[PDB]
């Protein structure tokens, strides 16, 4: 079956309330009252937090609450704390010993002011050029929230092929960092006079430029 | 205090068969049911099947019907999941979870709820061969220098499989260090970066060496960044 429909992301300040929607069909969410929710922190296993639409297992704080309406279940976190920043998945019994999981929702707790990103662009190293390879490495650091878009340009024209970008990861100082690579060959790297890595964060763009 | 202990990580080629085990401690498996949920890297949870040993033959999700099997060893409190004809899209972390999709009494558990989860089993499916990485220095420049500080790093390129560990000055340098997660390229090999922001006063005096360890290939590389 198709996965239950959840919002991609959701955010709120400490002390605020947030709601995750979970839309299924009349054969699962709208049929049974067996909707469960699960919290997953980065690099860890999911955690049982909600079952039977609105029942909380032993130990889960009453900050979390559940509800259902037609084919849409909802999870509410009332009084966001830094620990609540995680991924959340809904799940519903689908009949005949089967379950269906939701697409998952990222909960962001905006407990830190906006930080503008620092962009560092490295040209292909002389060591890699001898290996008949040329990789441009764009490093973005110290930005909050952790959401950026990276675009590459060569002499002003956009470059999308050969681009690989990591999702933002938390630094040691709780800010976020991201990396993007433009993998070429020395011949293709020498065929353009200037390369640009543009990073858009919260509506503002930052650009770094290198030249062969 | 029931706990689920899963088998270790595994690297397998396309066309082979996977076998992961889930061992129950602190309770009897005959009173429980076990679900299996997998999660591709950076993706969501996906239910695959469930087995209740006291109720007989298990049930599988439709997209896995024909290449997944579930079996239980009641005397050893362990269940097994076998996924056959592995493809690259089967690369995921495979969890087991105590479950009871039943109206009957869930002994020490919860009806229609996955309450106890295992630590997960990382499974990589790829045609690539074991290969150590090539390390390249990301030298500091005038474009990486601003306000008495400068950024330098190392490019760890083309290795398989995960993971690699990066340190700076044998682990003595940790302030300002950030090692990025790896990217999976079209070549089937991984690549990541590790950068460190460093005062510009020390660039001419202090030595900065990144230490890269790829234990699957027993490759250790030290690269001075000048």
Residue numbers in the entry:
A (entry chain B): 1 to 212
B (entry chain A): 1 to 226
From the paper:
IsdB is part of the S. aureus iron-regulated surface determinant (Isd) system, which plays an important role in the acquisition of iron from the human host. IsdB removes heme from hemoglobin and transports it to downstream Isd proteins, where heme is transported into the cell and degraded so that iron is released for use in fundamental cellular processes. IsdB binds hemoglobin and heme using widely conserved NEAr iron transport (NEAT) domains.
Efforts to crystallize NEAT2 in complex with STAU-399 or STAU-229 were unsuccessful. For STAU-399, we found that labeling of the NEAT2 peptides QVKSAITEF (residues 324 to 332) and MVEGQRVR (residues 396 to 403) reduced deuterium incorporation in the presence of Fab. We projected this epitope onto the surface of NEAT2 and designated this region antigenic site 2. The interaction with antigenic site 2 (defined by STAU-399 binding) showed that the long CDR-H3 of STAU-399 plays a key role in the recognition of this site, interacting near α-helix 3 of NEAT2. The canonical F54 residue on CDR-H2 of STAU-399 still interacts with IsdB but is removed from the heme-binding site. Conversely, when STAU-229 and STAU-399 were incubated with IsdB and associated with hemoglobin, we did not detect a difference in the binding signal compared to those for IsdB and hemoglobin binding alone. STAU-281 reduced growth when added to the medium, while an inhibitory effect was not detected for the STAU-399- or STAU-229-treated groups, in which the OD values did not differ from those of the group treated with heme alone. While STAU-399 did not block binding of hemoglobin or heme in vitro, it significantly reduced the burden in the kidneys, liver, and heart.
